[PDB]
Structure formats: C-alpha cells, structure tokens
Structure 1
Amino acid sequence: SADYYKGEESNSSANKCLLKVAGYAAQLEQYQKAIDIYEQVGTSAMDSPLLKYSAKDYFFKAALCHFCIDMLNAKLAVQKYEELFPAFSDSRECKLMKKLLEAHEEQNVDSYTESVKEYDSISRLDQWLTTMLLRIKKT
C-alpha cells in the first residue's frame, strides 16, 4: 500500500504506514528494519513544522529500539540523536534514558524501576513501550 501511495504521489499516508510497519516489526525482535524506518520517518518529519515536534517521539522510539543493541553505541546513538536535534534535550525522554543508563551501568535495577514507575505515574505508557522496558530490564 505504501509503495502504491508513493507511486500515486499521495503523501502523508506513506509516513504513517511505515510508522505502523516499524511498530509491528519491532514486536517480532527485528531491530534493523525498525531502526531504518523510524529514522526515515523522523528525518522526513523533522522539516515539517506540524510534525516536527512529534518527531521527538519517533527519535525516542528509535533510541529505545537501538538501546537493546548495546549500551556503548546506545549512548553514542543518544548523543548523536541529541546532536542532530538539540531541542530533543527539552523532552523528558533524554533525561529518562540517561537515568536508566546510569542505573544499568552498575546493575542497579532499583533506580530504573523507580524511574519507570514515576514515568508511568505521571503519564501512561504504551504496551509496546512497556514490553521494551521489561525486555531491557531482563538484560
């Protein structure tokens, strides 16, 4: 459907189709496809003022997907993501993952659990996000 839409010059739907495809794919433990699609959507929406702010969520999703790869490049990935979008620092997600990484650096599960509980209490989490958080906890 997305290929047909691109061939029809009908935009604003291919982006959502790719977003949903990546969200589904990340369920089956396939990260490269999800990372590529999420970064493509983020770079497409960065220049659009309407979706520019929402692009932060896509970057956060990509960072979460990239987190499972390895912490060493995950920090670099976060730094790179922060570098290209300095306004990303305004979002609480950056500090959230920074604290999670700080807790994980010494296997301190208590701090990560406290951070996740606080984030859930302040705002509800998605099922996919909760699943990824639990998977990271299993590490």
Structure 2
Amino acid sequence: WYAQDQSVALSNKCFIKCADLKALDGQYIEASDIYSKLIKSLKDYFLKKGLCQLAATDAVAAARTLQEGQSEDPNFADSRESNFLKSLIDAVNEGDSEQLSEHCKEFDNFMRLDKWKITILNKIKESIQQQED
C-alpha cells in the first residue's frame, strides 16, 4: 500500500519487517526476494540476502549476491559486511563449521550480531554439520 503511495522509506521499513519475519520463519527464499526488492541499510540488505540464501543451502546465489553488491555498490564492496559474507560462503563451500564459528566471533567482536543474524547463522552452521554427519 505504501509502494502504491510512492512512500519508499516506509515501504522499505515494511519489507524489512516482512523479510525478517519470513527468514525467521524458514521462508529463506522469499525473504531473499524481499531483500532484493529492498536493495532495488543497503549493506545490511546485501548481507541478509546472502544469509537467507545460505540457510537455503544456496551457496552460489550467496556468491552472486556478494558479487552484485561488490560491483554495483562501492560502499558495500570494501565493507566489513561483504568480507563477512565472502568468509561465510568460503566456509560453507568448504564444509568447515568451526571456521564459520570463528568468522562469526570475529564479526561479533567488531560488529555486534543481533538476534536475527545469530539465528540464521546457527541454521547455516547446522546445515553444514548435518552434511558432515
């Protein structure tokens, strides 16, 4: 309804709430799509998109989201968030859950992970450990 009213900022608040609740609810793909709409805070949107993709065992789409943000948005290219996302993708491709944990602790040390990121990161770790088992 806001998007019809051309209220971009409010509509963006709304789709942030929708995407966060969807991602917490296991609808990772749909949340990633809403994050694509929100992208089209930007650094944060890129991170979250990749994270949902990683919760959907979708490492390649996370890599593309990273590449998209790096090429299109210079502030995201050099950011800590892009570095965190590449490190997570590398861990996921490596099947290395402790490396994922280490990267999480580093990023927590420099940029506090809110409860949402912690939940999604735990889901990603669990998917790695399940593949290991």
TM-score interval w.r.t. the shorter chain? 0.7 to 0.9
Residue 37 of structure 2, aligned match among 36, 40, 52: 40
The CA deviation string for residues 91-115 of structure 1, in whole angstroms up to 9 with x for no partner, is 1111112222223333222222111
Structure number with greater CO (CA < 8 Å, separation at least 6) is: 2
The answer (yes or no) to whether the contact 1:103–1:112 under 8 Å persists in 2 is yes
Flag the structure with larger Rg: 1
SS of structure 2 residue aligned to 1:13: helix
Distance 1:123 1:18, change over 3 A: same
What is the RMSD computed on CA atoms of the aligned residues?
Answer: 2.0
The CA deviation string for residues 50-94 of structure 1, in whole angstroms up to 9 with x for no partner, is xxxx21111111111122332133222322232222331121111
Taking the aligned partners of 2:43 and 2:17, their CA distance within structure 1 comes to: 16
1:77 counterpart residue number: 65
**What runs of 5+ residues in structure 1 fail to find an aligned partner?**
44-53
Once the two structures are aligned, what percentage of the paired residues are identical?
37
Taking the aligned partners of 1:93 and 1:103, their CA distance within structure 2 comes to: 15
Amino acid at match of 2:19: A
The CA deviation string for residues 26-57 of structure 1, in whole angstroms up to 9 with x for no partner, is 111112321222111112xxxxxxxxxx2111
Amino acid at match of 1:103: A
Amino acid at match of 2:74: P
Amino acid at match of 2:69: Y
Residue 67 of structure 1, aligned match among 54, 59, 70: 54
Could you tell me the TM-score, scaled by structure 1's length? 0.77
Amino acid at match of 1:91: S
The answer (yes or no) to whether the contact 1:66–1:77 under 8 Å persists in 2 is no
**What runs of 5+ residues in structure 2 fail to find an aligned partner?**
128-133
Taking the aligned partners of 2:5 and 2:96, their CA distance within structure 1 comes to: 52
Could you tell me the TM-score, scaled by structure 2's length? 0.80
Residue 94 of structure 1 pairs with residue 78 of structure 2:
no
